[PDB]
Amino acid sequence: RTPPTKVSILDIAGVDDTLQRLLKEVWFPLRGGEACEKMGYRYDNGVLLHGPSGCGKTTLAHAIAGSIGVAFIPVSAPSVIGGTSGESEKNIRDVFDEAIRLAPCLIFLDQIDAIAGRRESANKGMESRIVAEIMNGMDRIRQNTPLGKNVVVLAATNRPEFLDPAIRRRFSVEIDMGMPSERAREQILRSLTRDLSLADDINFKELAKMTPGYVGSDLQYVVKAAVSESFQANIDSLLAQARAKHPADHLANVSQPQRDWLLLEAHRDEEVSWPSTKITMEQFRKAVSLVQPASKREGFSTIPDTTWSHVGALEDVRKKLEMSIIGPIKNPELFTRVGIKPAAGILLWGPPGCGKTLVAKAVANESKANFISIKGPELLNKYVGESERAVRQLFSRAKSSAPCILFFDQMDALVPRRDDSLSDASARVVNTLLTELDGVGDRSGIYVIGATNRPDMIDEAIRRPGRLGTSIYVGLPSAEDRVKILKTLYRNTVQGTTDADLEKVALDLRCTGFSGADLGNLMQAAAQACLERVYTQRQQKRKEGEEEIEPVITMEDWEKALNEVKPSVKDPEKYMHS
Amino acid sequence: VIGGTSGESEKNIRDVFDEAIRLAPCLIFLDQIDAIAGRRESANKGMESRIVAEIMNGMDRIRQNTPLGKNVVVLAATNRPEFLDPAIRRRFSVEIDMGMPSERAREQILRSLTRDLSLADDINFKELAKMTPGYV
Amino acid sequence: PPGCGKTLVAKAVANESKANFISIKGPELLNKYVGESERAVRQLFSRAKSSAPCILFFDQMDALVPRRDDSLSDASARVVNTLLTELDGVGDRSGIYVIGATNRPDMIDEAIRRPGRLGTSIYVGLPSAEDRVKIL
Amino acid sequence: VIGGTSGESEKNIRDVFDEAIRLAPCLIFLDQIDAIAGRRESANKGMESRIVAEIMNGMDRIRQNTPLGKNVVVLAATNRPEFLDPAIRRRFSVEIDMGMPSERAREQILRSLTRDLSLADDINFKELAKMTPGYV
Ligand SMILES: Nc1ncnc2c1ncn2[C@@H]1O[C@H](COP(=O)(O)OP(=O)(O)OP(=O)(O)O)[C@@H](O)[C@H]1O
Ligand SMILES: Nc1ncnc2c1ncn2[C@@H]1O[C@H](COP(=O)(O)OP(=O)(O)OP(=O)(O)O)[C@@H](O)[C@H]1O
Ligand SMILES: Nc1ncnc2c1ncn2[C@@H]1O[C@H](COP(=O)(O)OP(=O)(O)OP(=O)(O)O)[C@@H](O)[C@H]1O
C-alpha cells in the first residue's frame, strides 16, 4: 500500500492558466467517479508536463496528489530496473496491475527519457522491450476503464525531442511549464519570503519588474543570496572578538584569509549567539548583481566600459539608435499606448574601422542589456547535421532569455554565396537563418544587429523588412566631427591640455583626407616621436652631468608625425555606389 | 511480432507466413508498416535489416506455392510512403490513395461518436460536418 | 515589386472559383534528408490530384529556379527535374492550376517559363491612391 | 549476414563457408554484392574492410579442400562492376553479361509468359514487342 504525502499547495504560484487547465482535466474523472460511470463517456488518460529543469514539475505533481487526496504511486527513472533480464518487465506489470486494482490513483513517471528514449538510439534488446511493456500496460487500462477504474498517468520530462514518437502519440494532454511573467515572479518572491522578516524599504514589486529572464529556481536562489549577504556583519564581529581572546601577535598572519581561518580553528567548542537581523533593499540589489543563472552556460559575453563619450561625433546616429533600442527596453508603456510593435534589427555598413563594432557594444552597455557577438564563420562544424542545429539552438537560447542584443560581425561571409552557385552546406545554413528571422516579430526583447565592411554582395532577401530593415551608414567626411574625435582620444590621458593646438591640427589638408583609425594612428605616432626626444635629451644630461622624466607633448612632435603619416582608405566610390 | 531474444522475431514472421499459406482464403493485414520496414540506411541495427529480409523471403515463397490452390492477399496500411524502403515498394504492386475525408464521411463519423450521448434538438450534425474543412 | 499584394490577388482568384487553395512559401519546403525531397514533391501533386479543383500557390520562387543555368549541386538538380516532370504531366487531366509568385525575375530557367508549365508571365504593380488610404 | 555486435558478422561468414564445404553438391548465391564488398578506399569503417578479408580467406579454404570430394560453386549477382573492389574481381574467374532486353528479347519473354494462356488469332506478340520501348 502507498498512501499520499503532505506537501504545501500554497508554495507554487505564477501558473494560473496552466493550473486551471490541469484542474479541468483531472478533477472530473477523479472526484466525481460515480457520475462518469453512469454517463458512459470516456476521459483523459495521460498528462505530460514539460519545460526546463527545476521548474517545479515534480513538486506540482506531488502537490496535486496531496490536494485531491488520491493514492500516489511514484515511478522514478531507475526505480523499476532490476538485476536479471526479466525482473524489470515483471515489476512494470505489477505496478500497472496493483494500480488498476486500487482506485483512485495518480501514477507519476518522473524523468521518462531515461526509460523510453528513441528505439533507434537504443541498440540494446532490453530497452526496446521495456517500451513495449509500457504500451501493453496503456492498452490494458483503456479496456478495463468502463467498470469503475480511475487512474491518471502523469509524466515529467525536460526535453520532448528525446522521447520516442510512439509514446508521444499515446499521451494526449500536454502542459508547458515554461518562463513566468512580472505578476508571476512577484507571487513567487512572496512565497519564498513568507518565512523571513522583511524590512519596510523592500518592495517585491520593484524586484519582480527588474528581473527579466529568471525562473522559479533562480528567484529561490536570489532570496538565499540575500540571507548570506546580511550575515556579513556577524562575521566581522566574530573576527574582532577572536583577535582579542587569542591575540597570537603577528605570528598567525602571512595574509588576510588565512589568519581568519586559523582563529576559528583555535576556538572550536565556543558557541556564540546570533542576533536576528532584517534585510534591506540595498542588500537585495547587491545579491542580484552577483547572480548569473539559467542561461549561464550560453556563452554570455560581458558588456565593456564603452559609453557614448568614447565615440566622437555621430550624434545623429546616436539619437536614432536610442529611439530603436533604448526606447522599447526602458519605456514599454510608451510603445503600447501609441500602438507600434518593438524593433527586430539593424544593419551597420560602410568603410573599415569606423566604429561599427564599438557602436554595437555601446548600445548594449547603455541599455544595461546582454550582449552576444558571433563573428563570421563561428557556426560551421565538420559534421553533416550540426551547423543548422547550432543556429536553431542560438535562437532558442535568445527566446528563453531577454533583453539581449545579438550581434553578427562580418555578414559579408555568409550572405554573398546565394547570387552565384558555389556550395550545398552554405545553402542550408542561410536558408535556416532566413527561416529563423521570419519566425520572430511578436514578443521581442531580442534585437539583432548586423555589421559589414562590404555592403556590395548581399542577398536582397535578407535586406527585406521584418528581417534586417534599418540600414545605418557609418562614414566620416567632416571637420567638426574630427575635432570631437581628437578631443575624445586625448581625453583619456590621466600639466598641459592645449585646446587651440587640436583645432589647428584638424584644419590641415592631410587631416581632411583621413578616417577614425588614421587619427588614432597619428596620436600614437606623435607619442612615439615625443618619447625619442625625452630619451635622447635625458640620457645625454644624466651621463655628462639622476633627473626627472617629462611626459609632456608639444606641437613640434605633432607636426613631424603629421608630415610622415599617409591615409589608408583611398576610393570611397566602391562603398557608396554598391 | 517482436520478441525478447534475437531470433524469436524472425521465427514468428516465418510461422505467420507458414500458417497463412496452409489455410486459405485469407487476408493478411500489415497495419503501420514504417515501424517494421523503414529505410535500411536509416536503420543502423542488425535486427531491423534482418526483419526486412525475412519479409522478402516470405513474399517469394507465396509466389511459388500459388498455382496449387493457395489464395492469400496481403493488405498493408501506411501514413507516409517516403519512409518506406524502396525495395518493399517494388514488391507491392497495387496502390490505393485514401485522401481527404468528405462532408458525408465526417457526418457519419460524428454520428458514430455521438451515439452514446444525449443530444439536444437544436444540434444539426450536418451543419457541423459542412463547416469542418480539414479535420480527421 | 516587393510587397505589392501578390498573395491577395492569388486568394481572390481562388475564392471566386470557390475552389481549394494551398500556399507553400519559399524555404518552407526544404528538409535535412536527400531522397525524401523528391518523394515529398510527388506527394504534393498526388494530394492536389485527389482534391481537384485546387490552386497550388508557390510564393517566392527565387530559391528553387536559378540553380539550373549554373552547376551548383546534385540535390537541387534532382528536385527541379522532378518539378518539370510533374508540371508536364498535368495539362489534359487538369483541375490543378499552379500559380507562382516572385519579387525577383532575372535568373530563372527558360524551361520553366515554356507554355504548358508556368508559361503565362503576368506583370503586377501597385500605384493606386484609394488603396494607399485604406492601408494608412 | 550482418549482426549487432562487432564479431557476429564475421562468425556467420565462417559458419556459412564451413557448412557449405561440409555438405556437397551446393550452390552459394551472393545476391547484391556491392553492399558487402565495395572499394576499400571508399569505406572508412574498420568493419567493412574486415568483412572483405573474411570472404578472401573463405575463398582460399575452398581451393585447398577441393581435391578430396568437395563440390561447391559460388554464384554472384551485381548491378554495377565499377563499384566492386578490384581485389574480389580478380578472385572471380567466370563472368556472364545479362544485357538489355531488345525487340527480339521482349518478343521471347512475351512468348514465355503467354505459354499457359489461350491467345486469340488477332494477337501478334511481335507488334506488342515493337511498341514496347523501355520495359523490363
Ligand atoms: N515554480 C516554482 N515555485 C516555487 N518553488 C519552486 C518552483 N520550481 C522549483 N521550485 C523549488 O525548486 C525545487 C525543485 O522543483 P522540482 O524538482 O519539482 O523541479 P523539476 O522541474 O521537477 O526539476 P527536475 O524535473 O529536473 O527534477 C522545489 O522543491 C521547490 O522548492
Ligand atoms: N569613432 C571612433 N571612436 C573611437 N575609436 C574608433 C572610432 N572609429 C574607429 N575606432 C577604432 O577602430 C577600431 C575598430 O573599430 P570598429 O571595429 O568598431 O570599426 P568597424 O567599422 O567595425 O571596422 P572593422 O571592425 O572592420 O575595423 C577600434 O578599436 C577603435 O579604437
Ligand atoms: N500578415 C498579413 N497577411 C495577409 N494580409 C495582411 C497581413 N497584414 C495585413 N494584411 C492586410 O493587407 C493590407 C496590408 O497590405 P500589405 O502591405 O501587408 O501587403 P500584403 O500583400 O497584404 O502582405 P504581404 O506583403 O506580407 O503578403 C491591410 O489592409 C491588411 O488588412
UniProtKB/TrEMBL annotation, chain C:
ATP 4 binds at residues 3-8, 103, 114, 117. The chain holds residues 543 to 678 of 802 of the full protein. Mg(2+) 4 binds at residue 7. ADP 3 binds at residues 3, 5, 7-8. This is Peroxisomal ATPase PEX1. ADP 2 binds at residues 5, 7-8. ATP 3 binds at residues 3-8, 103, 114, 117. Belongs to the AAA ATPase family. Signal peptide: none annotated. Residues 1-128 form the AAA+ ATPase domain.
